[PDB]
Write a protein that binds this ligand. Structure first.
Ligand SMILES: CCCCCCCCCCCCCCCCCC(=O)OC[C@H](COP(=O)([O-])OCC(O)COP(=O)([O-])OC[C@@H](COC(=O)CCCCCCCCCCCCCCCCC)OC(=O)CCCCCCCCCCCCCCCCC)OC(=O)CCCCCCCCCCCCCCCCC
Ligand SMILES: CCCCC/C=C/C/C=C/C/C=C\C/C=C\CCCC(=O)O[C@H](COC(=O)CCCCCCCCCCCCCCCCC)COP(=O)(O)O[C@@H]1[C@H](O)[C@H](O)[C@@H](O)[C@H](O)[C@H]1O
Ligand SMILES: CCCCCCCCCCCCCCCCCC(=O)OC[C@H](COP(=O)(O)OCCN)OC(=O)CCCCCCCCCCCCCCCCC
Ligand SMILES: CCCCCCCCCCCCCCCCCC(=O)OC[C@H](COP(=O)(O)OCCN)OC(=O)CCCCCCCCCCCCCCCCC
Ligand SMILES: CCCCCCCCCCCCCCCCCC(=O)OC[C@H](COP(=O)(O)OCCN)OC(=O)CCCCCCCCCCCCCCCCC
Ligand SMILES: CCCCCCCCCCCCCCCCCC(=O)OC[C@H](COP(=O)(O)OCCN)OC(=O)CCCCCCCCCCCCCCCCC
Ligand SMILES: CCCCCCCCCCCC(=O)OC[C@H](COP(=O)(O)OCC[N+](C)(C)C)OC(=O)CCCCCCCCCCC
Ligand SMILES: CCCCCCCCCCCC(=O)OC[C@H](COP(=O)(O)OCC[N+](C)(C)C)OC(=O)CCCCCCCCCCC
Ligand code: SF4
Lengths: 86, 86, 89, 60, 177, 340, 184, 128, 233, 171
């Protein structure tokens, strides 16, 4: 027969990893505002997400598809001021 | 040779000044070579920003020696969280 | 470039004024190379130029081979004497 | 890659517009700080005539 | 100086008759229960497997009795062991070795004497080369009789040691001080 | 901040308890392979056994031998455990579902892994015994030897992907798990992972040496807990490397059709269900690999030091160099160099 | 945040000074090797701070994972004698140490300048009172990082260097065998 | 302050907390016999460092060049498409050169510990 | 000058079985000189037997090789029977032969499984100790003890077999062959087992004779000698 | 240009553009809608993009300040195409960029929505999606049926809309 007591610890491990991963997925989606995570993002994606922040009012990953930008988009441009790398 | 190649495989920060200086050296000869002094100067400037640092030192010395107010569109520093707020 | 320069100078002084053991000499060599690589990598970043980083990679590989050969030499030296004196060279 | 190629011109046009705006702004600010002194704020540190956005700001 | 008198009680019950009443008593009882539960459940002996008794000890770990079902694991190193089981005749040549192994055990530590040889010398009690009971060399917590004791007898002795563990006062003892 | 803390606590609890229950699973599985029961008494069905061992050890006196660098002997197991646990920060249980989503995640795995030999190396120096030094030397030699094998297999895999992001490497296996075209590499990676964790049959140091029980012979109390925990944590982490490099990580089957039947729009219910499916796939692969570690412990006798050094340097490494040649050759022949 | 996080580079510098001093002053040479490992972790920290985390990981992989391991292996197998730092042995060096410290540090800061006047040469060293302006553009459409670019130039523009390095590694194999193995 | 940095700080804290609990709760009663090194219950004499075999040195020393060889392929696998056929040829040449060194190591029997004592195979001859 | 490094392998060591103090001298890897120190279990048995009657001395033989109790008893009984000039009856002789071979099985289970456990094959020990449990039940049913039976005595055996024993021994025998096959499945063709055993501890036939080796230690070198066939008892 | 290193702060400039420079609208789409529209923007605005880049090359260093009028044309053309999409094909366009937001911005995860978007944009804007640089033998991947690489979860709304279009006959 299949020894079930010998499978109980494997079941505990499987359940712990499964539940932890499901909880982590829910927490990630909730942190993202209802969409899946971005992964493997290069410098291009990073700049695009910064521009998105300038367009949607700082609302994380919220998207807007209106053709014309608001007025504030002209004046909320950011340059970075980097300390001297000594 | 890897001369001219940036950290991302394109052209490095001072490539343009270097290329114009190399155009100069290619067109002149040893006797005429000093005619290319400005180009090389520009190249070194890009590399080390020495004249720019001197000019900023002068402007900042005059700035800290003034009690009169400044009336010009200013620079504003914001938190990275506040990119695009309001 | 400060951190690399200080590391190199102090490692060199430790190598020179070492009067304690031979392992300190090996370590000071390795750390002088580390300091040189740090200086180089900072300049590579400030120029946005791959040549500095390429040289730094080559320096790392050569430091590995130099370590292997130096320790082989030390072991061959040990084989005849069975000990390393605090002047062991 | 072709999607990014087709977006490159508009993004770079927006960024160039900003580069011009902020460079001219900084020149105006610096010339106002240097008013009353014998220093040319418009003179480039380079010898070519080309546009050179500032590197190197004063820490804010 | 100052304190000049005493209010000490005269019929304070002894540790074997004292029972928890004050919820600090109950807290310390719960803590002692946890510690003693861990001591019973993780019962790691170092084997001094001297002679034929060791064979019966081997059979305790064999499938019929399966000692590790109770949490018992035998350890080569005294540093990782809580229990010493003296299983076999202890000779005079061996006595300092046994004392040395016992002294290297970290605390807390207990000793089980297993079999007539270890208990008092057994069949070799009148020998010129035999220690007459391992309690001439080390303190002993439980004595298991038999030549050899059966596997079940050794398990019974382990249960007796676990009963002693389960009834130890640790934080309650400190509270008495 | 709060979400970050909650996520870290959940991940850490799951990892630490999985490690605790792996020891119970090993005891039970070995037992039933040996026609016995294993722990069934400390807790119901023996489910509190590991916690009893942990509390017992936490209350056990620490001994510092006389000739011993006591600081080095108390910090060596601590650093091995710390590096062992740090390795978990890059393991994803779904696309981007990780504590550290690093574009250099593979490199992180290799570097933290290469910090894993210092426990054996420093433990022998902890005392002043020549038995200890020789045993530590051998164990260190075995560890770096099989580190070479593991690194080679990593590089062979990256030849197919051209990315150091672990999520991306998993994502490319939606077409096929890499164990299918590279099955001998699955065998070799498992063998080398067993050797790299110094598990049977690669357990020279602990079971045939001058000291009775390896270089942990002198350890009692919490240092012993650190070494034991680090060992089992590395078993699971190296199995996770196996899973994402060759077994498709959190991928099981295409559930697009089933999800389109079950749900009509995105919700926390559909997101939770997808997360559960992904994590359960990765977990079941980890379970099979842990079971295999225990099964191999059950079936075989030990190598000697000479045998295992020969196995690594004369049999495995030449094959891996031949594979270094043949994989880019196949990519060139069919014009299948992976893009970035 | 800001106060600590602004001076992270300065903290790495101070820790590096301290770690070097501890390397030289260690009683046990194994402890000296451990302080060398500490210095390499500090160097990896600095490299991450200036944007080169890939070199942080490479340094951890190669100098700690390989070179420091070989160091420890050797000091474990070999019988090393060492004396302790003491006034009787080492105070005699203090004058030369001080002169050399000042001269070498100043010259190592001056070799970077292009000013004719020596005092200006030294002064330029401490002349970064300004912030660099980081700007964006959109000309790079590929996902090319430092490692990829290194591979690109090392395997094509500088392939000869790679093959010569292969010879150097060949030496790192053949030589140790030649002087540590006794044939026949 | 992302999850990565918080997790990396948290691990050593937990290790130190377990160590502190053990120090706080376990008894501590050192004494001379307990403080002895455990060597099977006996005591051994202090000895000059053991003479070791050269293969012990050679495994550790040869680890470094082979490790560097393996790690030098990281730039190739991260740039394979960009350098495609030219770099494929170059990396093949590099690998072949390193394989010649592997061949040298294999043929010299550099990592073999030879059992010094071997059975005597000489014939027995009698001078009649 | 070669300088040996000296290790005390045992007594408190798993392979040294608790009581062997094997002082070994190594030059690196290899054993150059070995010095087994014994007497950690010297009990003075031979002195004690001189103060006992023959019947009182019989149980000392149980405790010599304490996995082979009944064959130890058998050798003492045969010696005393030869000096007494008496004859064991036929059923007694058959019981002694049957329990001698049961004892041989018990001994070989212990020895082979302990040998495998020392090399690192941990599982044959558990499988074989269950068979040992089954055979020890026969020991206990004829003698009242699991190990030190004191069953074989000068003259024969102390009691007759109980009523249902031959049937139970037969039923154990119908499955012991499979029990042996599974151990052989784990060991006989395993390449690791061969790496640990082949050309290890070689003894030539002439040296085996000169050293006083017997049993398998002798039969392994090619010499067909076995007292059961050469001098039947 | 490299990303910022150890310590940096973002700073905003409050000045206005110099009044000599003619003002222009800015594109208001975020990354997902822009990626969804990118091929149509390319198709319509290729001449202006090419002219802008050629001006920048010919300026040989002063490109930002010398091509401002060309850049103004580029941005106006992009705004025009996005406005046309918002007037004629908004539902399908929203399908496509919301799908992209769920699929790590990978076009392979959104083929069903993209099919509807392409048909709409072609029928009402006369723009065609096309991948430059392929031979007639080579098949564009977005037109491939039965691809090796598929999304983990086909988008719900997109699956429903695709099936409905197949019933209606539009697709
Ligand atoms: C997968 C492992 C099983 C594979 C072989 C199954 C053999 C078998 O069932 O007959 C036993 C049989 C013993 O005969 P028997 O005892 O006289 O009669 C059996 C009982 O009447 C009947 O005994 P039974 O009631 O155990 O069998 C019915 C069984 C299933 O019956 C089947 O055989 C169905 C076909 C196989 C599917 C297995 C379903 C259950 C899988 C276990 C995981 C549960 C989730 O259904 C169950 O009861 C499942 C156990 C209850 C749940 C266990 C607790 C789960 C804890 C969490 C675990 C999570 C981690 C995993 O032995 C054999 O026939 C030969 C077995 C040799 C197997 C060779 C290797 C097979 C392939 C490799 C598998 C690697 C593992
Ligand atoms: C539910 C429980 C949680 C589950 C598992 C965790 C462990 C639970 C078990 C909790 C308590 C049992 C363990 C307590 C225990 O053995 O110390 C006993 C004393 O006993 C008490 O009276 C000392 C008071 C004990 C304080 C109890 C604190 C309990 C929570 C610990 C966090 C022995 O130390 P001890 O007298 O030699 O006293 C000390 C002590 O060991 C060292 O810290 C000192 O530095 C050293 O000088 C030494 O003298
Ligand atoms: C420092 C010791 C060595 C550093 C190890 C480098 C590990 C590494 O690769 O860090 C990368 C990671 C950010 O890298 P990246 O993948 O580009 O993040 C983008 C995510 N979308 O980095 C991170 O995510 C977090 C930063 C980790 C290193 C911070 C340590 C601070 C060093 C200053 C010490 C002060 C004294
Ligand atoms: C020891 C552990 C060995 C266990 C390995 C189990 C391998 C079985 C899973 C293989 C997974 C893989 O890489 O490809 C699976 C993939 C699934 O197809 P699907 O879910 O419909 O998604 C389509 C998008 N490609 O596409 C396939 O279905 C292809 C067919 C499966 C791969 C070949 C399976 C036959 C050989 C199995 C041998 C496995 C090792 C023994
Ligand atoms: C500050 C310098 C380095 C800067 C930052 C550190 C960089 C990262 C370090 C990586 C960790 C591995 C390397 C650690 C260096 C080892 C330190 C060391 O040398 O310890 C050994 C030494 C023993 O010497 P000892 O004989 O006891 O001196 C007595 C004098 N009366 O003991 C000593 O010399 C003094 C006691 C040292 C105690 C070390 C405690 C920390 C242990 C490492 C923890 C790592 C972090 C976790 C969030
Ligand atoms: C995270 C948890 C950290 C807990 C560490 C706390 C250590 C407290 C233990 C202690 O008091 O010092 C123990 C140390 C033992 O060494 P020692 O007694 O000198 O020599 C024994 C050789 N048989 O004795 C020492 O020499 C002290 C070494 C460390 C110095 C720390 C001083 C602690 C003072 C306590 C107040
Ligand atoms: C995060 C949780 C896991 C990590 C924490 C560390 C492990 C703690 C394990 C506690 C379990 C235990 O101690 O079991 C409970 C023990 C049982 O004692 P017993 O049955 O009399 O012993 C019998 C020994 N025999 C079988 C040999 C005879 O004490 C008690 O009933 C008192 C109540 C304790 C409540 C503590 C709850 C902890 C939450
Ligand atoms: C995942 C966790 C699943 C295991 C929990 C069930 C075990 C149990 O609750 O068992 C009962 C325990 C005491 O166990 P016991 O004294 O050994 O009795 C077992 C009877 N026997 C001897 C016949 C087998 O009671 C308790 O105090 C439970 C409090 C423990 C809290 C710590 C949980 C850690 C998470
Ligand atoms: S008590 Fe009996 S069985 Fe145990 S060792 Fe002594 S003689 Fe042997």
């Amino acid at each position: 027969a299949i020894p079930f007591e010998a499978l109980l610890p494997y079941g505990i491990i499987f359940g712990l990893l499964t539940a932890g991963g499901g909880a982590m997925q829910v927490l990630h989606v909730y942190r993202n505002g209802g969409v899946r995570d971005r992964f493997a993002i290069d410098q291009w994606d990073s700049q695009m997400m910064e521009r998105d922040l300038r367009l949607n009012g700082g609302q994380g990953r919220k998207q807007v598809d209106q053709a014309t930008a608001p007025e504030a988009f002209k004046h909320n441009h950011v340059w970075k001021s980097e300390r001297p790398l000594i | 040779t890897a001369a001219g190649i940036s950290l991302t495989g394109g052209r490095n920060r001072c490539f343009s000044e270097w290329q114009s200086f190399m155009h100069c050296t290619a067109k002149t000869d040893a006797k005429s070579r000093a005619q290319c002094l400005p180009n090389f100067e520009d190249y070194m400037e890009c590399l080390h920003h020495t004249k720019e640092k001197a000019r900023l030192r002068e402007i900042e010395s005059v700035l800290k020696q003034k009690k009169e107010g400044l009336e010009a569109p200013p620079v504003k520093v914001i938190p990275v969280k506040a990119i695009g707020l309001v | 470039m400060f951190i690399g320069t200080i590391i190199l100078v102090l490692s060199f002084l430790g190598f020179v004024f070492n009067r304690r053991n031979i392992i300190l000499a090996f370590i000071c060599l390795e750390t002088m190379l580390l300091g040189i690589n740090l200086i180089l990598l900072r300049n590579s970043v400030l120029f946005d130029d791959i040549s500095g980083s390429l040289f730094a990679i080559v320096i790392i590989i050569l430091a590995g081979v130099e370590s292997a050969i130096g320790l082989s030499l030390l072991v061959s030296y040990y084989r005849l004497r069975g000990v390393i004196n605090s002047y062991g060279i | 890659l072709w999607a990014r190629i087709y977006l490159m011109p508009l993004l770079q046009a927006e960024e160039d517009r900003q580069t011009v705006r902020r460079s001219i702004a900084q020149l105006e600010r610096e010339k106002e700080i240097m008013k009353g002194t014998g220093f040319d704020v418009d003179k480039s540190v380079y010898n070519d005539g080309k546009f050179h956005a500032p590197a190197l700001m004063i820490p804010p | 100086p100052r304190v000049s008198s005493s209010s000490m009680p005269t019929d304070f019950p002894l540790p074997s008759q004292q029972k928890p009443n004050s919820a600090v008593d109950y807290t310390l009882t719960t803590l002692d229960a946890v510690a003693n539960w861990a001591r019973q459940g993780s019962f790691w002996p170092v084997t001094f497997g001297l002679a034929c008794c060791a064979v019966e000890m081997m059979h305790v770990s064999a499938p019929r009795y399966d000692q590790d079902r109770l949490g018992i694991i035998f350890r080569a190193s005294p540093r990782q062991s809580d229990i010493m089981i003296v299983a076999g005749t202890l000779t005079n040549k061996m006595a300092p070795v046994l004392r040395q192994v016992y002294d290297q055990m970290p605390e807390p530590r207990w000793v089980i004497s297993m079999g007539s040889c270890a208990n008092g010398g057994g069949y070799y009690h009148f020998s010129y080369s035999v220690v007459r009971g391992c309690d001439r060399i080390v303190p002993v917590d439980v004595y298991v009789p038999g030549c050899p004791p059966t596997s079940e007898a050794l398990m019974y002795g382990v249960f007796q040691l676990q009963r002693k563990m389960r009834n130890t006062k640790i934080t309650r003892m400190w509270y008495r001080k | 901040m709060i979400i970050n803390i909650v996520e870290i606590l959940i991940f850490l609890v799951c990892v630490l308890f999985s490690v605790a229950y792996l020891t119970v699973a090993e005891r039970k599985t070995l037992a039933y392979m040996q026609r016995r029961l294993g722990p069934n008494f400390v807790g119901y069905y023996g489910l509190l056994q590991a916690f009893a061992d942990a509390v017992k050890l936490l209350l056990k006196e620490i001994v510092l031998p006389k000739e011993s660098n006591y600081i080095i002997l108390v910090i060596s197991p601590l650093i091995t455990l710390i590096t062992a646990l740090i390795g978990w920060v890059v393991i994803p249980l779904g696309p981007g579902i990780t504590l550290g989503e690093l574009n250099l995640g593979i490199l992180f795995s290799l570097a933290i892994g290469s910090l894993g030999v210092f426990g054996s190396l420093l433990s022998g120096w902890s005392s002043n015994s020549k038995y200890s030094l020789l045993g530590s030397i051998r164990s260190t030699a075995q560890l770096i030897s099989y580190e070479l094998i593991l690194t080679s297999i990593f590089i062979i895999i990256i030849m197919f992907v051209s990315s150091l992001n672990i999520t991306t490497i998993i994502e490319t296996q939606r077409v096929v798990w890499y164990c299918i075209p590279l099955l001998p590499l699955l065998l070799i990676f498992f063998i080398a992972s067993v050797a790299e964790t110094a598990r049977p049959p690669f357990d020279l140091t602990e079971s045939e040496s001058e000291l009775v029980a390896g270089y942990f012979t002198e350890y009692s109390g919490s240092p012993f807990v650190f070494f034991f925990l680090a060992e089992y944590s590395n078993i699971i982490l190296i199995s996770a490397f196996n899973g994402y490099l060759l077994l498709g990580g959190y991928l099981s089957f295409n559930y697009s059709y089933l999800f389109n039947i079950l749900f009509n729009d995105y919700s926390y219910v559909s997101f939770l269900f997808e997360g559960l499916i992904n994590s359960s796939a990765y977990a079941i692969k980890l379970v099979f690999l842990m079971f295999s570690f225990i099964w191999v412990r059950a079936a075989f006798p030990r190598f000697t030091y000479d045998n295992l050094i020969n196995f690594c340097w004369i049999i495995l490494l030449p094959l891996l160099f031949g594979i270094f040649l043949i994989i880019p050759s196949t990519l060139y022949i069919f014009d299948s160099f992976p893009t970035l | 945040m800001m106060y600590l996080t602004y001076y992270f580079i300065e903290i790495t510098i101070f820790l590096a000074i301290l770690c070097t001093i501890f390397i030289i002053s260690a009683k046990n040479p194994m402890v000296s090797i451990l302080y060398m490992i500490a210095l390499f972790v500090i160097a990896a920290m600095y490299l991450y701070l200036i944007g080169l985390g890939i070199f942080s990981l490479l340094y951890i992989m190669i100098y700690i994972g390989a070179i420091a391991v070989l160091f420890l292996f050797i000091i474990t197998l070999l019988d090393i004698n060492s004396t302790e730092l003491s006034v009787k042995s080492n105070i005699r060096d203090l004058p030369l140490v001080l002169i050399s410290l000042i001269v070498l540090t100043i010259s190592g800061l001056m070799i970077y300048s292009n000013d004719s006047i020596l005092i200006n040469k030294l002064l330029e060293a401490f002349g970064n009172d300004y912030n660099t302006i980081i700007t964006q553009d959109w000309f790079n459409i590929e996902n090319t990082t430092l490692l990829t670019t290194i591979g690109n130039v090392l395997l094509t523009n500088n392939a000869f260097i790679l093959l010569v390095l292969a010879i150097v590694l060949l030496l790192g194999i053949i030589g140790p065998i030649s002087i540590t193995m006794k044939h026949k | 302050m992302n999850t990565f940095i918080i997790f990396i700080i948290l691990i050593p804290i937990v290790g130190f907390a377990l160590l502190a609990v053990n120090i706080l709760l376990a008894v501590y009663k050192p004494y001379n016999e307990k403080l002895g090194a455990f060597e099977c219950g006996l005591t051994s004499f202090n000895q000059t460092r053991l003479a070791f075999n050269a293969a012990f040195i050679l495994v550790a020393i040869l680890f470094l060049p082979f490790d560097l060889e393996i790690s030098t392929l990281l730039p190739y696998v991260m740039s394979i498409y960009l350098v495609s056929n030219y770099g494929f040829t170059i990396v093949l040449l590099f690998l072949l050169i390193l394989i010649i060194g592997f061949v040298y190591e294999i043929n010299t029997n550099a990592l073999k510990i030879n059992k010094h004592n071997k059975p005597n195979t000489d014939s027995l001859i009698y001078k009649l | 000058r070669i300088r040996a490094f000296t290790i005390n392998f045992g007594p408190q060591h798993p392979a040294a079985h608790g009581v062997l103090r094997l002082i070994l001298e190594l030059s690196g890897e290899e054993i150059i000189r070995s010095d087994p120190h014994v007497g950690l279990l010297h009990r003075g048995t031979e002195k004690l037997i001189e103060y006992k009657t023959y019947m009182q001395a019989l149980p000392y033989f149980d405790r010599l090789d304490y996995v082979s109790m009944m064959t130890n008893e058998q050798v003492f009984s045969l010696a005393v029977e030869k000096l007494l000039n008496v004859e064991v009856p036929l059923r007694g002789k058959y019981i002694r032969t049957m329990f001698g071979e049961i004892t041989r099985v018990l001994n070989h289970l212990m020895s082979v499984c302990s040998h495998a456990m020392d090399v690192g094959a941990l599982t044959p020990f558990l499988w074989g100790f269950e068979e040992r449990e089954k055979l020890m039940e026969f020991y206990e049913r004829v003698s009242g003890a699991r190990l030190h039976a004191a069953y074989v005595r000068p003259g024969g055996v102390s009691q007759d077999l109980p009523a249902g024993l031959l049937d139970d021994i037969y039923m154990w025998a119908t499955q012991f062959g499979d029990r042996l096959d599974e151990i052989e499945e784990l060991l006989t063709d395993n390449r690791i087992w061969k790496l640990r055993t082949v050309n290890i501890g070689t003894v030539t036939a002439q040296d085996a004779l000169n050293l006083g080796l017997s049993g398998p230690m002798l039969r392994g070198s090619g010499i067909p000698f076995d007292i059961r066939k050469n001098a039947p008892y | 240009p490299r990303e910022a290193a150890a310590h940096w702060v973002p700073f905003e400039d409050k000045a206005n553009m110099p009044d000599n420079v003619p003002d222009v609208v800015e594109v208001g789409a975020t990354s997902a809608p822009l990626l969804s529209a990118s091929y149509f923007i390319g198709a319509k605005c290729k001449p202006y993009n090419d002219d802008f880049m050629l001006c920048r090359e010919e300026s040989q260093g002063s490109g930002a300040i010398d091509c401002l009028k060309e850049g103004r044309r580029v941005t106006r053309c992009a705004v025009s195409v996005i406005e046309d999409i918002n007037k004629s094909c908004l539902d399908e366009f929203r399908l496509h960029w919301q799908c992209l937001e769920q699929n790590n911005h990978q076009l392979s995860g959104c083929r069903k929505a993209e099919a509807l978007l392409n048909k709409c944009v072609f029928t009402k804007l006369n723009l065609e999606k096309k991948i430059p640089g392929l031979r007639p033998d080579e098949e564009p991947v977005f037109l491939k049926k039965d691809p090796w690489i598929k999304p983990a979860v086909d988008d719900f709304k997109s699956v429903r809309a695709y099936a409905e279009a197949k019933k209606n006959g539009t697709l």
